[PDB]
């Protein structure tokens, strides 16, 4: 509770409407009822049987508010691929996190080579059955930071390479008094 | 494909007095349910997915979790259902073919009746969605 939110996907009640490549058949937006019994906006992709996956998801422009070091909290789940029909093999258990600094707050397209890789993020844990009643805290939480940041704001992008994954929330923040 | 959005309001004729709105969504489809917005006259609704017994009786359980909380009528509020059999999300909804699902609201449409556990517009205005997944 000593950190200022630059973005929280949970705060959006209408839709995130983030840009995605491909726009259909890759990352897709769906609602869920979260841990706090609140409907939120999430992104997911599960093209595990399809080869050569390169599914890009990209946030809207995020202002730094002049903070040169920014933290990125991603809460996500991984459906065990061998729980899906037909899928026999080894599961993709990672995705890649990128960023791109820009003064421009309305970048039109995802230009793949312009994004800089923050890290490959790994699922500590996977699941095979959806939770029906009360939300059990088995989501993965991974935090990374980026900086020093030079420009007015930046974009976060996620690359899926064939996992069965749901980004439950994305939270971007800076620490106010470290 | 994306089905036609359902706006949850009293001035919204998809809800027959008889048996309310009936849908036939197929596996893979998605559907938005939108709260009534006004830049007019305010409407307030808590919308729940429920089982057959609750829907018939127009009642809500104390542990039930509202898909949609239409407490902010000046704001855009929406729930996008994906009619998937296998959720990549631990907390996502899953559906199966030849099974019927139900959305209702026992709020009466006013601010003071938003928390009403039974009756409301489910009873009076037949505001009740039957979703016949994977059927004719
Ligand atoms: C009920 O929803 C809204 C009121 O917010 C209105 O615009 C709409 O025309 C109504 N009916 C339908 C089918 O959308």
Numbering used by the authors:
A (entry chain A): 28 to 205
B (entry chain B): 28 to 66, 71 to 167
Task: Give verbatim excerpts from the published study on this entry.
The EphA4 tyrosine kinase cell surface receptor regulates an array of physiological processes and is the only currently known class A Eph receptor that binds both A and B class ephrins with high affinity. Eph receptors are type 1 membrane proteins with an N-terminal extracellular region consisting of a ligand binding domain (LBD), a cysteine rich region, and two fibronectin type III domains. We have solved the crystal structure of the EphA4 ligand binding domain alone and in complex with (1) ephrinB2 and (2) ephrinA2. Structural analyses, drawing on previously reported Eph receptor structures, show that EphA4 in isolation and in complex with ephrinA2 resembles other class A Eph receptors but on binding ephrinB2 assumes structural hallmarks of the class B Eph receptors.
The EphA4-ephrinB2 structure is the first cross-class EphA type complex. In the EphA4-ephrinB2 structure, electron density corresponding to a single N-acetylglucosamine moiety was observed at Asn36ephrinB2 (conserved with Asn42ephrinA2) but not Asn139ephrinB2. In contrast, the JKEphA4 loop is very different between its two bound states (2.8 Å rmsd over Cα atoms of residues Ala150EphA4-Leu166EphA4); forming an extended conformation when bound to ephrinB2 and an α helix (Gln156EphA4-Asp161EphA4) when bound to ephrinA2. As a result, we suggest that the plasticity of the JKEphA4 loop region allows EphA4 to physically adapt to Trp122ephrinB2 and the resulting complementary stacking interactions with Arg162EphA4 are compensatory. While the EphA4-ephrinB2 interface is comprised of 15 hydrogen bonds and a total of 30 residues participating in van der Waals interactions, EphA4-ephrinA2 contains only 6 and 22, respectively. Conspicuously, in the Eph receptor tree, EphA4 in its ephrinB2-bound state is the most structurally similar out of all A class Eph receptors to the B class Eph receptors. We find that EphA4 has greatest affinity for ephrinA4 (KD = 36 nM), intermediate affinities to ephrinA1, ephrinA5, and ephrinA2 (KD = 1.2 μM, KD = 360 nM, and KD = 2.3 μM, respectively), binds most weakly to ephrinB2 (KD = 10.8 μM), and shows no detectable binding to ephrinB1.
